[PDB]
């Protein structure tokens, strides 16, 4: 019955129905001659009962699908289109997204694909209300109260395409026009001038390195490749010494307010990337931010804390990102490989802005509920959990595809979340590569998915993913099941999903932090 | 054209759409039988053109039409019903509610109401969509963000009715049930058990009536009629007395810290409570409501101040009221007339329970816009200003009715507002008595409206309202005009809107605290 899999108190007929659609650069135009099924790839969905042409009520979601593929953590942002059917369109919201069992309560053919269907004359007779087609509406994230929508390809050729926001046209730096449009969501809401605080960043630097003492101190440098410890306590000097600059006056105010601001972990912070920054990545603003968004520590120069974004204006951002990317300059002829020129102002400033931004958004946006719901495991700051015993449960005779969700949370600062291993039994269970993504306080991550040793795969979020007292994330694992064949307990490689946090050094090796949670394969 | 007065994004048509609406105490099981129109009354509204069964989406708010209208303020609450229309329906939200402007919009008859055109044939083929009949739909409130339906009274005879809650049922005390279902709205939530106040406030009258200190502070009253001051005076050292008690050492605790708590304010709330309080009055409880909701001083028993509830919790609060019955009880005598401590420990105890039990909902609710957007009036602690410049012109050929929005504040504790006295030009400018309203945190109050000398109709709200810090309100004006004949501006009686507030002693008469508002009668 369509009772079971259809929400009638969300679903309704509307004349002129409007959705926006987040779109990519070099796109952003031609979308608005039509929408039509691109001639390869995944066509909206990695299952073909799901491919179609996707839109969402709130134009700040789209946006999120608007960032250039290609180098999704510093790429360009596209922009948002506004598409509206004319005449009348019946919204069918669903209670369950298995497209499999969708199609035996509404009696459809299991031959045929979902989608495709829902864009028959006939599907449209019975579940249209008079409509002259149906576009099915799913919830659109955990944390999230917005909703998605999967239009039928064929039926989105009658939408009109009108232009929300073109980022690229602003002319701004990086992603400064995507996330000031995410910015205007709460009008909460820290909304820094990202252009302002460049230059204040760029004219304090060139200021510091003048500070007769701040030269002083940086001929006692070593010079050369010293020990981790070592190069840790001359920044920690370093530190100290630049903290007494008066271009820094208001920052070195706030150090002392809280322990995550210290010298020490200015030090630790500039070590590590030095660390990790080598000539190619250096040299490449998209590895950078690949490379500085895994590091723990970034609360100490973004001054995130206890659940608040305590640098909150232009000045001691500018501040702390000068005296840190100063640090940086220092510690790279110490550990790294390059030299304190270039990277250090440049790719470092650009590359950690885009991380403040995305820090920002997520204390902008309203917490994925902090409590963990089944005991969660804790391991070096962060907590996972089962959403619910019941999303611990692989059952062995799930049909279509099965659902997981995981709340991932961390203690305090700003902690990264590098990846997520997910078990699989090739050409049984397989991961669905467009349904799985994490939501960060319900903002909607994808994720880039490969296959590594052992049948589990790896996916990497597509734009940095970080928890910590106010950001809470939701991991959603969408299983696909390619094979009617029988799944035993005993059959999966692997029995865990694991969760890869921040990289730390082990063994004199980077590695990064690793939590698993355990599955039931059960009937 | 329909654009202009329908909001599409808010427009759909929708199978099995149900709403709530409240219901009185005699109505709650005879209503599930039916949805009839009353044979006589108002039948939905004053005005011809609104006349049709009304409902919301919300619940709690359905709650707030549930009060007995003989005894509003005390009465029992009924209940509330879910009404449910079978099929296929089409909410239309309008983005005026203007009748006049939506029949000339909609291109309807000018001669027929609105509503009961809204039930014809041919409206519903010509705006509904498919659906079988057509509910109009506009925003609840200001401070709110439910809606408000209207349905054609023959077209809603189809209406399936269910219940929702009876409150009588709960077999509960005074208006306690009605008041517990409002607090599940939010779970801010302050849900007092008033029936485990109940019990400990009679525990500790006992407890402190048979103190040592306490009875003998007693033996020193004058016992009989001596001044305010002296009144005041002896019921101060009463307090203090009395606030030594092992009983009321957490309201002790209490009263040193915030200035609103002291004695001095005990004891003046009670000289004022003992001195309105004649024999006729302490008899009726809901005459002893009326006379306490108009006094000023409240927010130093509920404990109230600086836009938090500290009284919180079961024993404070039934400390709090125990207190100050005694004192009331002490007072009597004193101030005013044979209705002794009789009437302190029990009608003044649940008159006064009933009046947490509202500014408790008020602060559980989520405070309307705090600013002033317009120069506010000040006044006696009141500051009140004009929604918008808008709101203070009468143009004077609007046609139909028009519509008024002035925002109401108090400083800081709980003041009341008593009512509003309107203008009119009795043949041509009318108060249309179902409309105007004053809306507090988004709840909505009725008026009970009654003409005065001057061409001056006075307006009292159905239930306590309260200003203060964090509770602030929308006094809704609606107009109808009953002639084509324009109006001259000399023509209106009173140009201003008066706001009264608490009653104090002018001239040792009880006079209300009044504060004005200027009208501009313009084209
Ligand atoms: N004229 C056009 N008509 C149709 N598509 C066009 C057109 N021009 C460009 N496209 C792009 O084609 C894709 C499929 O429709 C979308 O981007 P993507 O990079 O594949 O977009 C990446 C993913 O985001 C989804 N997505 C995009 C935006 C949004 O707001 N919501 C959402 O879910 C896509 O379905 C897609 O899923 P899959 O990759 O799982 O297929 C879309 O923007
Ligand atoms: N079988 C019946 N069929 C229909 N109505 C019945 C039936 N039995 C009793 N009633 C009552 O008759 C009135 C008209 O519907 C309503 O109460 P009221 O006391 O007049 O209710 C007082 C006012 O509250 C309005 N109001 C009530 C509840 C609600 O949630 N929303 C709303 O705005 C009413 O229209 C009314 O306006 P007017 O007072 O301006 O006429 C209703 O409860």
Redesign the interface.
């Known amino acids: 019955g369509a009772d079971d899999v259809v929400d009638?108190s969300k679903?309704?007929?509307?004349?002129?129905f409007?959705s926006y659609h987040g779109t990519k650069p070099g796109y952003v135009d031609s979308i608005q001659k039509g929408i039509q099924k691109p001639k390869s790839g995944t066509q909206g969905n990695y299952d073909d009962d799901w491919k179609g042409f996707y839109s969402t009520d709130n134009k700040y979601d789209a946006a999120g699908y608007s960032v250039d593929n290609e180098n999704p953590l510093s790429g360009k942002a596209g922009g948002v289109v506004k598409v509206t059917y004319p005449g009348?369109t019946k919204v069918l919201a669903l209670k369950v997204d298995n497209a499999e069992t969708i199609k035996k309560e509404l009696g459809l053919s299991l031959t045929e694909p979902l989608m495709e269907q829902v864009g028959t004359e006939e599907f449209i007779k019975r579940f249209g209300?008079?409509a002259s087609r149906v576009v099915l509406s799913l919830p659109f994230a955990e944390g999230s109260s917005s909703v998605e929508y999967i239009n039928n390809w064929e039926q989105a050729k009658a939408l009109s395409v009108e232009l929300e926001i073109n980022f690229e046209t602003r002319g701004k730096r990086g992603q400064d026009a995507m996330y000031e449009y995410m910015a205007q969501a709460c009008a909460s809401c820290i909304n820094l001038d990202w252009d302002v605080i460049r230059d204040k960043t760029k004219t304090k630097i060139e200021s510091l390195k003048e500070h007769g003492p701040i030269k002083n101190k940086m001929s006692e440098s070593p010079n050369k490749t010293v020990s981790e410890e070592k190069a840790k306590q001359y920044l920690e000097e370093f530190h100290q010494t630049a903290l007494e600059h008066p271009e820094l006056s208001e920052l070195k105010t706030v150090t002392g307010t809280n322990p995550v601001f210290a010298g020490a972990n200015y030090a630790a912070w500039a070590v590590n990337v030095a660390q990790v920054i080598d000539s190619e990545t250096a040299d490449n603003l998209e590895k950078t931010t690949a490379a500085l968004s895994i590091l723990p520590g970034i609360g100490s120069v973004m001054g995130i804390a206890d659940g608040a974004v305590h640098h909150n204006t232009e000045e001691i951002v500018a501040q702390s990102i000068a005296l840190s990317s100063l640090m940086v300059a220092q510690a790279i002829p110490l550990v790294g490989e390059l030299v304190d020129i270039g990277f250090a102002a440049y790719n470092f400033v650009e590359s950690i802005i885009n991380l403040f931004q995305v820090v920002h958004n997520s204390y902008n946006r309203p917490a994925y509920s902090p409590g963990h719901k089944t005991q969660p495991f804790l391991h070096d700051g962060y907590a996972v959990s089962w959403n619910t015993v019941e999303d611990s449960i692989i059952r062995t005779g799930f049909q279509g595809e099965s659902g997981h969700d995981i709340k991932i949370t961390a203690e305090n600062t700003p902690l990264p979340i590098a990846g997520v291993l997910l078990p699989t039994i090739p050409g049984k269970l397989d991961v669905n590569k467009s349904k799985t993504h994490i939501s960060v306080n319900g903002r909607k991550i994808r994720m880039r998915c490969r296959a590594i040793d052992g049948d589990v795969t790896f996916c990497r979020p597509k734009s940095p993913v970080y928890v910590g007292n106010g950001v809470h994330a939701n991991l959603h694992v969408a299983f696909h099941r390619s094979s009617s064949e029988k799944i035993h307990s005993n059959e999966i490689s692997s029995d865990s999903i694991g969760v890869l946090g921040y990289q730390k050094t082990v063994d004199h090796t980077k590695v990064n932090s690793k939590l698993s949670l355990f599955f039931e394969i059960k009937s």
């Open positions: 009638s679903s309704f007929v509307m004349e002129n409007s009348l209300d008079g």
